[PDB]
Amino acid sequence: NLIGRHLRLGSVEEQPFMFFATEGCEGNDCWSGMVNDMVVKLSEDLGFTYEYIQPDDRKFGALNKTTNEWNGMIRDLLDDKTDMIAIDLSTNSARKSAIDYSFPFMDAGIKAVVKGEGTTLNQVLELLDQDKYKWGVIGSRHPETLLKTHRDSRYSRLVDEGVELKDLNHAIETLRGGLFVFIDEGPVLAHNLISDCDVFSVGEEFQSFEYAFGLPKDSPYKSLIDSHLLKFREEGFIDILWEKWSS
Amino acid sequence: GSKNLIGRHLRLGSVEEQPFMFFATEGCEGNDCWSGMVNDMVVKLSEDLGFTYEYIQPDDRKFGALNKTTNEWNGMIRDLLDDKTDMIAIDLSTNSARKSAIDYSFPFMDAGIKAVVKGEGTTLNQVLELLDQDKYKWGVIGSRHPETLLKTHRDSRYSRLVDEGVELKDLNHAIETLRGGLFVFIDEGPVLAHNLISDCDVFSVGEEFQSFEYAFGLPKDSPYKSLIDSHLLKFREEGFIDILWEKWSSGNSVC
Numbered sequence: 001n002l003i004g005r006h007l008r009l010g011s012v013e014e015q016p017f018m019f020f021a022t023e024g025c026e027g028n029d030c031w032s033g034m035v036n037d038m039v040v041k042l043s044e045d046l047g048f049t050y051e052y053i054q055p056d057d058r059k060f061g062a063l064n065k066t067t068n069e070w071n072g073m074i075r076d077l078l079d080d081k082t083d084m085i086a087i088d089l090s091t092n093s094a095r096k097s098a099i100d101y102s103f104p105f106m107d108a109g110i111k112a113v114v115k116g117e118g119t120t121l122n123q124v125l126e127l128l129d130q131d132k133y134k135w136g137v138i139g140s141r142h143p144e145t146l147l148k149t150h151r152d153s154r155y156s157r158l159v160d161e162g163v164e165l166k167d168l169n170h171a172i173e174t175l176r177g178g179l180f181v182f183i184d185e186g187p188v189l190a191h192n193l194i195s196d197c198d199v200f201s202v203g204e205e206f207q208s209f210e211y212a213f214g215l216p217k218d219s220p221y222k223s224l225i226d227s228h229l230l231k232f233r234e235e236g237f238i239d240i241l242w243e244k245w246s247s
Numbered sequence: 248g249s250k251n252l253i254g255r256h257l258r259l260g261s262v263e264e265q266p267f268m269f270f271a272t273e274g275c276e277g278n279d280c281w282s283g284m285v286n287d288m289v290v291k292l293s294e295d296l297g298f299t300y301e302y303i304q305p306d307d308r309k310f311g312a313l314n315k316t317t318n319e320w321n322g323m324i325r326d327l328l329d330d331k332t333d334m335i336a337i338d339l340s341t342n343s344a345r346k347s348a349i350d351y352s353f354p355f356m357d358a359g360i361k362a363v364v365k366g367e368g369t370t371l372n373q374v375l376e377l378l379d380q381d382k383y384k385w386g387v388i389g390s391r392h393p394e395t396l397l398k399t400h401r402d403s404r405y406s407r408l409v410d411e412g413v414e415l416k417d418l419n420h421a422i423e424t425l426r427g428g429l430f431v432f433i434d435e436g437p438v439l440a441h442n443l444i445s446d447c448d449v450f451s452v453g454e455e456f457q458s459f460e461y462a463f464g465l466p467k468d469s470p471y472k473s474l475i476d477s478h479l480l481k482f483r484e485e486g487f488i489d490i491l492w493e494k495w496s497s498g499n500s501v502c
């Protein structure tokens with residue numbers, strides 16, 4: 001079904017899933033990481049060519065409830081600028097209302113972290129009842145969406161009253177600045193903070209979701225992508241790649 | 248697209264597999280014979296999506312595997328392929344053999360293969376050690392997912408394990424045989440965790456291995472997959488699946 005086809009793949013840098021070199025490379029060779037290794041193997045086995053297309057707005061994607069419009073990689077997919085989103089794309093109901101997901105490749109949860117040993121914070125909602133710590137989530141990323149759609153609207157308060165963060169670099173910078181709880185995703189934080197010995201978890205992880213690829217509704221490629229991703233998991237390839245790429 | 252589930256009557260494949268499904272064999276009729284985590288999910292789905300349903304068990308009482316001699320399926324998988332059912336509503340493990348013939352819903356639970364053992368004295372650290380000894384017997388249940396995963400593993404020593412193990416008919420027979428002693432039973436983590444909670448003389452053989460999911464089974468080209476997938480994702484995101492596991496899975500331990 002994919003032999004000879006060309007796939008336009010939405011992606012962005014998100015270590016260790018994807019690394020994007022901004023110079024010293026051309027085309028697909030600018031990309032590396034766990035997801036890139038998956039795409040390369042898919043392309044070899046299924047016989048397609050591909051390219052990566054980043055959203056101009058550099059966002060993952062969320063639905064703005066004021067305008068009822070999407071942004072980020074989700075929007076590029078809906079606009080038919082891409083055929084599939086190849087990244088750690090978290091599963092949530094808002095996205096599911098607009099796009100499909102492939103078979104998942106990894107489980108993930110929401111994790112909150114803070115700099116400084118011995119934090120008094122036991123659970124993130126406690127942030128609302130104090131002013132020693134600031135906190136935040138990154139705009140147009142999955143954790144913001146999950147917290148805003150949580151049944152307990154105190155999670156919407158956390159988002160609305162938090163610091164808006166531009167991207168992962170900005171968030172980690174702010175975290176490393178102290179007195180700041182950053183709420184994001186376990187696997188991304190596990191990598192990326194491996195060497196920050198003075199950064200600690202706040203509470204336990206919460207919400208259970210998956211990382212998958214994103215597909216447009218009625219994609220003719222979903223069946224094959226799903227089958228091959230399942231085989232990757234069953235054969236141990238996903239675990240081998242995580243061991244290869246995660247610090 | 249246009250087709251939804253309102254007013255449809257679904258035939259759902261299932262069998263008893265505690266704590267996912269319990270089937271009463273007397274003193275009940277129809278859907279009232281069924282209870283468990285999966286039943287609670289189906290009830291909620293039926294209310295939200297507007298379908299009625301019944302459960303249909305395969306006569307062979309198998310989950311389903313592909314016979315490489317005949318190229319035919321059995322169990323719930325076969326019933327689905329034969330249009331006796333519309334969806335398999337159970338802890339249906341994801342594997343590539345099944346995926347060649349059917350689709351899966353969005354998953355509801357992670358699971359792994361787990362090996363357990365009863366016996367005093369020397370014990371085992373990893374299942375392949377079984378091949379180089381004769382103190383312990385061992386087995387997997389025929390036409391169930393662990394057998395399929397071991398038979399398709401690229402290390403054919405796992406096929407030896409299956410081929411040289413004792414034949415087990417179903418979960419009751421396997422647990423019976425395990426409790427008889429000097430036996431390694433290789434099955435699925437969540438199933439064993441629930442059903443062996445009180446067996447203080449049953450221990451692990453190594454760590455869990457192979458990661459897969461439990462999902463519902465759907466025929467290829469089902470007009471209902473999108474809706475079922477969306478609703479199952481919402482169940483997970485809302486914490487409903489976790490609440491049901493806490494409701495149904497065994498707690499405490501006399502051990």
Ligand SMILES: [Mg+2]
Nearest residue numbers: 107210357460
């Ligand atoms: Mg999973």
